[PDB]
Structures are given as C-alpha cells and as structure tokens.
Amino acid sequence: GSSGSSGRKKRIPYSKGQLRELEREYAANKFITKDKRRKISAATSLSERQITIWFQNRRVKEKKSGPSSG
C-alpha cells in the first residue's frame, strides 16, 4: 500500500473496457485504417497514436527474438 511493496504499480495501461475494443479490432486485422482508428478513439477514448502503438506492439511481439520475454 505504501511501503514493503516489490513494485506492482504503473502496470500495463488501457483498461479492460479499452483493450476490449482494441483486441477485437486486432483479431479482425493486425493493422487498422484512419477510419477504424478514429472510431476506436471514440469508444476507448484513446488517441489515434496510442491505439496504433498498441496494435504495433501486438504484432512486433511475434516479430522480434523473444516470444516469452517480459
């Protein structure tokens, strides 16, 4: 709570309600367009850039050498 904590703060961003739309859109297409990207920003209330960064990390995750690295 205050002290004696290894460090479980500043964890992964994007709430379940936000990632819910991202994950779904991703499953449909690894890459979105200005259109979809704009819609998601209206639902998840995220920035066109933020959403992109997430979609990229999702793909790159299986591109670089490190499937189980984190």
Short mmCIF file of N, CA and C in Angstrom, two decimals:
data_model
loop_
_atom_site.label_atom_id
_atom_site.label_comp_id
_atom_site.label_asym_id
_atom_site.label_seq_id
_atom_site.Cartn_x
_atom_site.Cartn_y
_atom_site.Cartn_z
N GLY A 1 0.81 -1.21 0.00
CA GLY A 1 0.00 0.00 0.00
C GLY A 1 0.84 1.26 0.00
N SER A 2 1.84 1.30 0.87
CA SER A 2 2.72 2.46 0.98
C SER A 2 4.19 2.04 0.94
N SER A 3 4.52 1.03 1.75
CA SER A 3 5.89 0.53 1.81
C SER A 3 5.91 -0.99 1.89
N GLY A 4 7.08 -1.57 1.64
CA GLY A 4 7.21 -3.02 1.69
C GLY A 4 6.63 -3.69 0.46
N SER A 5 6.55 -2.94 -0.64
CA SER A 5 6.00 -3.47 -1.88
C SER A 5 7.09 -3.61 -2.94
N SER A 6 7.22 -4.81 -3.50
CA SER A 6 8.22 -5.07 -4.53
C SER A 6 8.11 -4.07 -5.67
N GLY A 7 6.87 -3.73 -6.03
CA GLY A 7 6.65 -2.79 -7.11
C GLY A 7 5.60 -3.27 -8.10
N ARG A 8 4.34 -3.19 -7.70
CA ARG A 8 3.24 -3.63 -8.56
C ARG A 8 2.41 -2.44 -9.03
N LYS A 9 3.08 -1.31 -9.26
CA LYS A 9 2.41 -0.10 -9.72
C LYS A 9 2.80 0.23 -11.16
N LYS A 10 2.09 1.17 -11.76
CA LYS A 10 2.36 1.58 -13.13
C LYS A 10 2.32 0.39 -14.07
N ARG A 11 1.44 -0.56 -13.78
CA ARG A 11 1.30 -1.76 -14.61
C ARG A 11 0.80 -1.40 -16.01
N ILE A 12 0.52 -2.42 -16.81
CA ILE A 12 0.04 -2.21 -18.17
C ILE A 12 -1.16 -1.27 -18.19
N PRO A 13 -1.15 -0.32 -19.13
CA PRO A 13 -2.23 0.66 -19.28
C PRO A 13 -3.43 0.09 -20.03
N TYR A 14 -4.37 0.96 -20.39
CA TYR A 14 -5.57 0.54 -21.10
C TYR A 14 -6.42 -0.40 -20.25
N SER A 15 -7.58 0.09 -19.83
CA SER A 15 -8.48 -0.71 -19.00
C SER A 15 -9.13 -1.82 -19.82
N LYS A 16 -9.77 -2.76 -19.12
CA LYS A 16 -10.43 -3.88 -19.78
C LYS A 16 -11.44 -3.39 -20.81
N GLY A 17 -12.09 -2.27 -20.51
CA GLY A 17 -13.07 -1.71 -21.43
C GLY A 17 -12.44 -1.13 -22.67
N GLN A 18 -11.20 -0.66 -22.54
CA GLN A 18 -10.48 -0.07 -23.67
C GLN A 18 -9.86 -1.15 -24.55
N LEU A 19 -9.14 -2.08 -23.92
CA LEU A 19 -8.50 -3.17 -24.64
C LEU A 19 -9.54 -4.08 -25.28
N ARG A 20 -10.75 -4.07 -24.74
CA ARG A 20 -11.83 -4.89 -25.26
C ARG A 20 -12.10 -4.58 -26.73
N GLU A 21 -12.03 -3.30 -27.08
CA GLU A 21 -12.27 -2.87 -28.45
C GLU A 21 -11.02 -3.06 -29.31
N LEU A 22 -9.86 -2.84 -28.70
CA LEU A 22 -8.59 -2.99 -29.40
C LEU A 22 -8.35 -4.45 -29.80
N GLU A 23 -8.42 -5.34 -28.83
CA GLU A 23 -8.22 -6.76 -29.08
C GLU A 23 -9.15 -7.26 -30.18
N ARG A 24 -10.42 -6.89 -30.08
CA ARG A 24 -11.42 -7.30 -31.07
C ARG A 24 -11.02 -6.83 -32.46
N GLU A 25 -10.75 -5.54 -32.60
CA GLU A 25 -10.36 -4.97 -33.88
C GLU A 25 -9.09 -5.63 -34.41
N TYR A 26 -8.16 -5.93 -33.50
CA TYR A 26 -6.91 -6.56 -33.88
C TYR A 26 -7.15 -7.94 -34.49
N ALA A 27 -7.93 -8.76 -33.80
CA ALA A 27 -8.25 -10.10 -34.27
C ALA A 27 -8.79 -10.06 -35.70
N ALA A 28 -9.48 -8.98 -36.04
CA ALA A 28 -10.04 -8.82 -37.37
C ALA A 28 -8.98 -8.37 -38.37
N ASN A 29 -8.04 -7.56 -37.90
CA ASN A 29 -6.97 -7.06 -38.75
C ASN A 29 -5.79 -6.56 -37.91
N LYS A 30 -4.60 -7.06 -38.22
CA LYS A 30 -3.40 -6.67 -37.50
C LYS A 30 -3.15 -5.17 -37.63
N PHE A 31 -3.62 -4.59 -38.72
CA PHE A 31 -3.45 -3.16 -38.96
C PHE A 31 -4.78 -2.51 -39.34
N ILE A 32 -5.08 -1.38 -38.70
CA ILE A 32 -6.32 -0.66 -38.96
C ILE A 32 -6.07 0.54 -39.87
N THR A 33 -7.13 1.28 -40.16
CA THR A 33 -7.03 2.46 -41.01
C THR A 33 -7.50 3.71 -40.28
N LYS A 34 -7.30 4.87 -40.91
CA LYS A 34 -7.71 6.14 -40.32
C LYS A 34 -9.16 6.09 -39.87
N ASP A 35 -9.98 5.35 -40.61
CA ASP A 35 -11.40 5.22 -40.29
C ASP A 35 -11.59 4.48 -38.97
N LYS A 36 -11.24 3.20 -38.96
CA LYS A 36 -11.37 2.39 -37.76
C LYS A 36 -10.65 3.03 -36.58
N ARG A 37 -9.41 3.46 -36.80
CA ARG A 37 -8.62 4.10 -35.76
C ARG A 37 -9.39 5.26 -35.12
N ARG A 38 -10.13 5.99 -35.95
CA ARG A 38 -10.91 7.13 -35.46
C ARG A 38 -12.07 6.66 -34.60
N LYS A 39 -12.72 5.58 -35.02
CA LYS A 39 -13.85 5.03 -34.28
C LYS A 39 -13.41 4.55 -32.90
N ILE A 40 -12.36 3.74 -32.86
CA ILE A 40 -11.84 3.21 -31.61
C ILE A 40 -11.53 4.34 -30.63
N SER A 41 -11.01 5.44 -31.15
CA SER A 41 -10.66 6.59 -30.32
C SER A 41 -11.91 7.19 -29.68
N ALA A 42 -13.06 6.97 -30.31
CA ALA A 42 -14.32 7.48 -29.80
C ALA A 42 -14.92 6.54 -28.75
N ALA A 43 -14.56 5.27 -28.84
CA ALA A 43 -15.06 4.27 -27.91
C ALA A 43 -14.14 4.14 -26.70
N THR A 44 -12.89 3.77 -26.95
CA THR A 44 -11.91 3.61 -25.89
C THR A 44 -11.45 4.96 -25.35
N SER A 45 -11.81 6.02 -26.05
CA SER A 45 -11.44 7.37 -25.65
C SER A 45 -9.92 7.55 -25.68
N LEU A 46 -9.26 6.77 -26.52
CA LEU A 46 -7.81 6.83 -26.64
C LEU A 46 -7.40 7.69 -27.84
N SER A 47 -6.11 8.00 -27.93
CA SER A 47 -5.60 8.81 -29.03
C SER A 47 -5.26 7.94 -30.24
N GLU A 48 -5.41 8.51 -31.43
CA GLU A 48 -5.13 7.79 -32.66
C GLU A 48 -3.73 7.18 -32.62
N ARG A 49 -2.82 7.84 -31.92
CA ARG A 49 -1.45 7.36 -31.80
C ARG A 49 -1.36 6.21 -30.79
N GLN A 50 -1.96 6.41 -29.62
CA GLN A 50 -1.94 5.39 -28.58
C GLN A 50 -2.43 4.05 -29.12
N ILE A 51 -3.59 4.07 -29.77
CA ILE A 51 -4.16 2.85 -30.33
C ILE A 51 -3.18 2.17 -31.28
N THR A 52 -2.53 2.97 -32.13
CA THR A 52 -1.57 2.45 -33.09
C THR A 52 -0.41 1.76 -32.38
N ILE A 53 0.20 2.46 -31.43
CA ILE A 53 1.32 1.91 -30.68
C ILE A 53 0.98 0.54 -30.10
N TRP A 54 -0.25 0.39 -29.64
CA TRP A 54 -0.70 -0.87 -29.06
C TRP A 54 -0.81 -1.95 -30.13
N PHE A 55 -1.40 -1.60 -31.27
CA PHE A 55 -1.56 -2.54 -32.38
C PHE A 55 -0.21 -2.99 -32.90
N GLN A 56 0.77 -2.10 -32.86
CA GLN A 56 2.12 -2.41 -33.34
C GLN A 56 2.81 -3.39 -32.40
N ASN A 57 2.83 -3.06 -31.11
CA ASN A 57 3.46 -3.91 -30.11
C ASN A 57 2.86 -5.31 -30.13
N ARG A 58 1.58 -5.40 -30.50
CA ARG A 58 0.89 -6.68 -30.56
C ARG A 58 1.48 -7.57 -31.65
N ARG A 59 1.80 -6.96 -32.79
CA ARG A 59 2.37 -7.69 -33.92
C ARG A 59 3.86 -7.91 -33.72
N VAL A 60 4.59 -6.82 -33.47
CA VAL A 60 6.03 -6.90 -33.27
C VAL A 60 6.38 -7.93 -32.20
N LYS A 61 5.47 -8.13 -31.26
CA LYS A 61 5.68 -9.10 -30.18
C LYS A 61 6.06 -10.46 -30.74
N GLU A 62 5.55 -10.78 -31.93
CA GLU A 62 5.83 -12.05 -32.57
C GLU A 62 6.71 -11.86 -33.80
N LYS A 63 7.52 -10.80 -33.78
CA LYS A 63 8.41 -10.50 -34.89
C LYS A 63 9.87 -10.53 -34.45
N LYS A 64 10.14 -9.96 -33.28
CA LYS A 64 11.49 -9.93 -32.74
C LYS A 64 11.81 -11.22 -31.98
N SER A 65 13.08 -11.41 -31.65
CA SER A 65 13.51 -12.60 -30.93
C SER A 65 13.18 -12.49 -29.45
N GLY A 66 12.05 -13.06 -29.05
CA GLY A 66 11.63 -13.02 -27.66
C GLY A 66 10.14 -13.24 -27.50
N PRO A 67 9.70 -14.49 -27.70
CA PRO A 67 8.29 -14.86 -27.58
C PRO A 67 7.80 -14.82 -26.13
N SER A 68 8.67 -15.22 -25.21
CA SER A 68 8.33 -15.24 -23.79
C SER A 68 9.27 -14.34 -23.00
N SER A 69 9.38 -13.08 -23.42
CA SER A 69 10.25 -12.12 -22.75
C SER A 69 9.44 -10.95 -22.21
N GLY A 70 9.57 -10.70 -20.91
CA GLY A 70 8.85 -9.61 -20.28
C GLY A 70 9.12 -9.50 -18.80
#
